[PDB]
A paper describes a structure:
In previous work, we designed and characterized conserpin, a synthetic serpin that folds reversibly, is functional, thermostable and resistant to polymerization. The reactive center loop (RCL) protrudes from the main body of the molecule and contains the scissile bond (P1 and P1’ residues), which mediates α1-AT’s inhibitory specificity against the target protease, neutrophil elastase (HNE).
Like conserpin and indeed many other serpins, the RCL of conserpin-AATRCL is too flexible to be modelled into the electron density. SDS-PAGE using 1:1 and 2:1 serpin: protease molar ratios reveals a faint complex between conserpin-AATRCL and HNE, but also showed a large amount of cleaved species compared to the complex formation between α1-AT and HNE.
Residue numbers in the entry: -4 to 316, 331 to 361
Write the structure that this text describes.
Amino acid sequence: QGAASSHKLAEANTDFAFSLYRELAKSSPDKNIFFSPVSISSALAMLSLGAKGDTHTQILEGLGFNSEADIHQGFQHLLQTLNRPKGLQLKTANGLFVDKSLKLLDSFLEDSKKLYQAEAFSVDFDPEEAKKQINDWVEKQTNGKIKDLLKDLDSDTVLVLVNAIYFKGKWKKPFDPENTKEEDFHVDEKTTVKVPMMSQKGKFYYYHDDELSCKVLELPYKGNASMLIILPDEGGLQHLEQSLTPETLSKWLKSLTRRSVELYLPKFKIEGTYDLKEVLSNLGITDLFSPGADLSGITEEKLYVSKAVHKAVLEVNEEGTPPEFKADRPFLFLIRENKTGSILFMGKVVNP
């Protein structure tokens, strides 16, 4: 009863972010992780617009809300904030593609656009020319930074959710290229990888958690966002991930002090592609992706979510505007919006 506060929204999003991280990490060790948890929260909420019955409850309770919670005004306000000119101006894509034989309730069509600024398309689902149209659209929407998103397409497909994002930020305090020297990145005991190491000597907000044997450090982005980098102490990553709760994050933000750091960070590019069906399956959101889904708020005809791809790409370089922090082994990071607190990105860099 009543649109949730902004604070409910920032708490739910963030307990959803970390639980999602925790599941991806469980299901694929030794692999790079990169996703935008705010984008997934948003795409589910958009879908909750058309979800009735218990398809609805699974989504809300998965995202972190009361069954009878009202979340839309809140999300609208938030995206409005992130998608502002003083922000990161994120090159993004969120398409909804339904079989063309389905008369969609054109109120759902209206709402998802004003509230979530994400377009929905009615399309014919022959496997061939339809994957092209979609992949080609994703390409456009991200300015060629996410090419050929979808791999295959089953014949019987009726509803495709696509969610894709590319990010490359400008640093507040830029690295000097003439400090970038090739170095060894110890991926593990038996594996070495030559990476270009950016080095900066300056003042950064910093903290050595030894309650969790690891280092934490903030890098500020141009558009009022910051990267939180978490460097585990020698071979303690496993346990670190276990201790990766919204409560720990807050402990860390309280503990950072602005210090002189000798900072060594690899320039890198990573990516993550995720099938939301198998990932959200553990988070309790299951019906939505299965024959008996209630989406009668999308169309009076039968319908469920046939496939859902989320893909995020991050590129980190030096551009552009004492304790040593040397990330020459696998580390965690996240990128948070300074004004809202919203976790835009979480990530793990194992293979730069």
